[PDB]
């Protein structure tokens with residue numbers, strides 16, 4: 001199953017505070033509208049092995 | 064019609080009020 | 086009739102100036118160009134210019150004079166080139182104005 | 183601790199010791215004449 | 231730490247210079263340094279206290295000597311540009 005990461009996955013590149021500053025940063029970011037892999041844990045269903053490739057955007061919704 | 068690194072802006076000799084008076 | 090036409094024309098000029106957003110295009114462009122040139126001149130301060138760092142105090146510290154001289158010389162060359170470019174562009178723009 | 187160690191690793195298996203959360207005295211290292219070569223290919227050998 | 235005075239500072243190697251005052255801006259917990267549109271180091275947090283220190287460059291500005299002709303008189307009047315002279319005597 002494939003799902004689309006709409007806009008989430010943006011982190012502060014460094015520890016500098018800026019106010020009303022449109023700063024351009026070149027670093028490892030998750031592309032906007034980039035399809036990521038869906039995984040299941042209920043019902044059996046297990047967790048597979050995945051590589052790293054210099055960056056992973058994890059996002060788990062839990063109750 | 065619409066911080067310092069050695070940079071200073073010099074005010075004009077004729078202010079806007081006196082230009083308007085002219 | 087001439088007085089009425091002149092008054093209506095003055096009113097229409099007022100309304101057109103109020104409504105059109107790019108009416109003050111020439112003055113707005115001059116101000117924007119000067120601000121852009123100043124902003125790029127300031128941004129040239131943070132450029133590395135081939136030294137170990139763009140911070141003059143960083144270069145002065147954690148550095149012995151014999152190579153701090155060459156690092157400072159590279160910074161001087163870069164910053165002087167940037168300032169000369171800005172001054173020449175400002176001279177051109179002042180001639181146009 | 184690492185300078186006076188009785189054993190040192192080989193070049194093909196060089197170690198990487200991390201030093202952190204401490205006050206470092208480079209003055210004794212610089213003034214120690216036991217070193218034959220003390221030149222620095224980084225920034226400086228004294229201003230550290 | 232001394233505030234509201236033009237004192238040099240070296241915050242764990244920053245070795246900057248300016249005037250450190252109380253900062254009304256609210257630094258985020260992870261952020262340490264501060265910059266602006268010109269990436270000037272506008273604010274710095276203390277290394278021992280969770281205090282934000284606004285930093286302003288020390289007052290500078292070219293002086294001008296308004297003088298009549300020396301053949302007329304030797305008296306002059308000095309203009310310290312772009313500074314309030316509550317702090318001119320230094």
Ligand SMILES: *[C@@H]1O[C@H](CO)[C@@H](O)[C@H](O)[C@H]1NC(C)=O
Pocket residue numbers: 002003034035
């Ligand atoms: C998600 O995007 C990838 C990369 O373009 C594409 O190969 C894949 O088919 C897309 N998935 C779906 C369900 O459309």
Ligand SMILES: *[C@@H]1O[C@H](CO)[C@@H](O)[C@H](O)[C@H]1NC(C)=O
Pocket residue numbers: 299301302
């Ligand atoms: C200064 O004033 C004197 C007296 O009038 C005059 O002779 C002299 O030429 C003046 N100097 C200049 C440079 O004009």
Ligand SMILES: *[C@@H]1O[C@H](CO)[C@@H](O)[C@H](O)[C@H]1NC(C)=O
Pocket residue numbers: 314315316
């Ligand atoms: C100096 O003059 C400026 C003018 O803008 C004013 O804002 C400032 O408060 C004055 N300084 C003092 C110390 O009163």
